Amino acid sequence: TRHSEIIKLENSIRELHDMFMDMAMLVESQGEMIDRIEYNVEHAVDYVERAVSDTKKAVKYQS
Amino acid sequence: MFMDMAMLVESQGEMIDRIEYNVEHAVDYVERAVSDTKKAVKYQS
Amino acid sequence: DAGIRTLVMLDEQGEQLERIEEGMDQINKDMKEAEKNLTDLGSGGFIRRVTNDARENEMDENLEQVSGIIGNLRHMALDMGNEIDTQNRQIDRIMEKADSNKTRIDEANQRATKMLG
Amino acid sequence: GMDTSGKQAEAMALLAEAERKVKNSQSFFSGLFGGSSKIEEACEIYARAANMFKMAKNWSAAGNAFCQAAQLHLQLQSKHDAATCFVDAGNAFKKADPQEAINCLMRAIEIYTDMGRFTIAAKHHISIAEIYETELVDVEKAIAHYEQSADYYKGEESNSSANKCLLKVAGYAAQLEQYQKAIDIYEQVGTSAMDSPLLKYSAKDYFFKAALCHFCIDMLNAKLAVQKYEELFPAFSDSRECKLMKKLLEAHEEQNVDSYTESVKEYDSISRLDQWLTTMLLRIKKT
Amino acid sequence: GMDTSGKQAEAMALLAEAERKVKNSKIEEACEIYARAANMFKMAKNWSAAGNAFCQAAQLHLQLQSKHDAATCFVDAGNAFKKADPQEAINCLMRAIEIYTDMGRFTIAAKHHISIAEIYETELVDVEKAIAHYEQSADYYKGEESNSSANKCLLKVAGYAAQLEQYQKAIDIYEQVGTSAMDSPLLKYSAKDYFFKAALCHFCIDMLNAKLAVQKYEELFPAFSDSRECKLMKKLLEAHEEQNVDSYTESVKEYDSISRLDQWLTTMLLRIKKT
Amino acid sequence: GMDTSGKQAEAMALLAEAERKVKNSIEEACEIYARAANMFKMAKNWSAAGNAFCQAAQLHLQLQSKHDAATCFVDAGNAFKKADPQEAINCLMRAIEIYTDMGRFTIAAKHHISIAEIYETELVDVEKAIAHYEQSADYYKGEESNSSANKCLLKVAGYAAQLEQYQKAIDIYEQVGTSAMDSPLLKYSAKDYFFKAALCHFCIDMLNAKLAVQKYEELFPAFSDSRECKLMKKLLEAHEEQNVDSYTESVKEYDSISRLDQWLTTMLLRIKKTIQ
């Protein structure tokens, strides 16, 4: 009984820690990816804003 | 480990909320520009 | 308690992620339509009893409690994985869409300067 | 610190430049009609002045500059950036005075909802509710703002988002010595989470809260209600909540104060308890 | 199953219509209709024909003035060939990788490097080109500061080298990664595991140096003592002093009772035990 | 091999083309320089690549562009960060100034974090690194990002306690713990921070530490229930009795109970040095 329960608990905690480390690595990768995506989208929105403003002022000057 | 993960997940949540706000502004201005372009093209014709 | 709070807030984050994915699809479609229009413009025991005293008894039960709780913890932990795992894929997907978006506007800008000259 | 003085001086000089530019803009309009360029340029000057004042740590000057920029740009019939400038002014005033922030955010919400931008309006409503709760004891304003934001989010098809607003409203109602509303919200949230695969585990706790707040209205009706909960979520028996509730009921049945106190102390020893639970327990002990 | 025949016939008819249209300013429409025909074949689930149609559509797109969409079409053609003659898939993915690197997007290039390496090693038995691809991906990722994926590639190549008896590179990679993890507050708990594996690999070179290596690891990372893995390693090291098979066999059985050892771990354990 | 030499030759040709085109006298030169810098990076030539990126950024800024010019400056800085810390520092400072002018204060705080990180790890620098950390924390606090601000403040407090007096560390730990008291997630760590404060006082003198721990116990009763309360009481008794043997016994027992991070043990040894 002692061995059964002790090794069962050891296996449970080991699997818990394994999936937790896997999830932490995945979460770090996700954090890097989302930081990149935020940078990319901020740059894209700034670029499109500048382009549309430039087009508006150009058409106003020409019309 | 749980405490560190909790803090990291909260930071990720704030990151996501900020990205949501930026995207909301982006879509708002995109819709406004779409309306302006539609009006301009319709009236120019 | 911390596990439960993390799971619930991760569920909220996942719903928000789906919402922002819908918003990104809306952005893509609207920008494509605008560009097209603009182009068209142109377990048995846990402790042995060294002494027959009450101090031993509760130990077993105590230990048992933790054991049982760990069982529960298992599902909790596993559950978390699932959620985040799914979210993973979603993020990758949006990347490609985002790329296309910017790419298009790039040439669009050039067009706005190429025809005017 | 030379940095602070230098930043203040340059910000003041740029703000004076903006003021003189707006002043002679009217003269130019009357004389030669330069156009609308002068107003927009003054708008960017005011925004830069506000940013430089913020970098100088003078929040009041930044807020004032944001207000002037908002007014000047709104005169050009551009309401989106006007509301953005009101939001900036409210953020600036947040450190100096938390009252002008309220009206600035109200105006920003009105502008945003004029165009159907309900997301920003709801977020600003939540921010104003939080500001009211932190500053003023008038929980009614926070409740109104929170329920308005929750209604907007429900109209936005945002699931699992207004639920937090409903939970906050329930907590406020329970704190305000009004129980039926909080009990109803708690039970509704719990039964909703029942069908949620993840929130179901937490759902049981919500029931307890309802029962707890249902124990202030009257003892027996709460006890009976537990059965209604117990049948709904039989796993609630496995949790310590059933044992705690039944033991408290048994202790109160015979005015056994010592048993009540000992159980509360042991439960706190297992893990720290929240202020809400302590207040509920104290109020129940009055009987 | 008449549905497959119907889809094939519809896709062939669409391809014929595209060919007539292109044969009849028309470059853009020709490229678009060819791409639509390729997508129709892909929908029909004819992997060979769909891949051929999509690759000729990619070529015609290259005939059209575009680079970014050209790279996207190249990578999509490589994915389509994934379930076809692997040589064409590999070559098209090389072309897409080169185009992406020319555009400066190194992260996607390294992701495609990992993809090609994995598909090549899993399908074909040769490993050297896959290791080279993984190394190139790690180089780009580290140059771009993508620590996670570069470290994953380094770990993969280290594992392959250890499997290939080139334990020196594997132990060096594991040691550097583990000390870097020690530097960072995060992932340190897992890094010791790498040391354990590395320590095992270390014994493969010789026996007497195992004691010195474990002492160096202990003094470098004192908490590594708490690892039951280190206790098992030292027990087995002491047991190996005598020519007895019962000791280490029972030891590995007992440890496996806790968690199931990885197949590679069991293989290297048997290798060390036998000789 | 062939690849590096060919890519280097192509980059040289691109630089020559851009130089002659500018001599003919504008953006096309900027894209040519950017492509040449990408060519150098592909060649793995860390040198002459960050310089090319900086030159392209300056050329594009010549027409008042800031966004993409700032991005290219940051790229040059990151490229030179591994090769030459000074060039990366200059590029990061330029990016910080440009983004502060444009209002991207979050980017400025990130660049300050990077500068402080390189100063602590790459260079031998503590004062400027501490100043950069403080500036980044203030910027993040202004941008409603308090987690990184608290982390940087804790790091600065640790550094100050290590090299300077503990008063700054005392204030930082006390304020952080008080803020975390109400915080539900950070509450448990709050006690730890409070605990640290006591240690910071014990190094200075026994009376100040005693008064501080009494104040914390009265204000925050939970700290009493933790093992840290008993450990601090025992250490206080050992110091008061001027019997370093008891201090040593308590330290060994506490180390045996749980592992140490090599910092608490160092502080306790320093305290043992002043016990006399």
Residue numbers in the entry:
A (entry chain I): 197 to 259
B (entry chain G): 215 to 259
C (entry chain H): 41 to 82, 130 to 204
D (entry chain J): 0 to 286
E (entry chain L): 0 to 23, 36 to 286
F (entry chain K): 0 to 24, 38 to 288
How do the authors describe this structure?
To gain insight into the structural nature of binary complex formation and disassembly by NSF, we prepared a complex of NSF, ɑ-SNAP, and the binary t-SNARE complex (21bin20S) composed of full-length soluble SNAP-25 and soluble syntaxin-1a (1–267) in the absence of divalent cation (i.e., non-hydrolyzing conditions) and performed single-particle cryo-EM. Next, the dataset from which they were derived was combined with two additional datasets to enable the 3D reconstruction of weakly populated states with ordered density for the ɑ-SNAP—SNARE spire. All classes revealed substrate-bound NSF without Mg2+ needed for ATP hydrolysis and disassembly, and share the same overall architecture, with a spire composed of NSF N-domains and the ɑ-SNAP—SNARE subcomplex on top, the NSF D1 ring in the middle tier, and the NSF D2 ring forming the bottom tier. As such, the stoichiometry of the syntaxin—SNAP-25 complex observed is 2:1, the dominant species in solution. Of the eight 21bin20S classes with the 2:1 binary SNARE complex from the dataset collected under non-hydrolyzing conditions, six engage syntaxin and two engage SNAP-25 within the pore of the D1 ring. Docking the 2:1 binary complex structure back into the seven individual 21bin20S reconstructions reveals an apparent preference for syntaxin, with six of eight reconstructions featuring the N-terminus of syntaxin H3 bound within the pore of the D1 ring. Taken together, we observe that the NSF D1 ring can bind to at least two different SNAREs, syntaxin, and SNAP-25, in various configurations.
The membrane-anchored SNARE (soluble N-ethylmaleimide-sensitive factor acceptor protein receptor) proteins provide the energy to drive membrane fusion in various cellular contexts, such as intracellular trafficking and exocytosis. NSF comprises three structured domains connected by flexible linkers—the adapter N-domain followed by the D1 and D2 AAA+ domains.
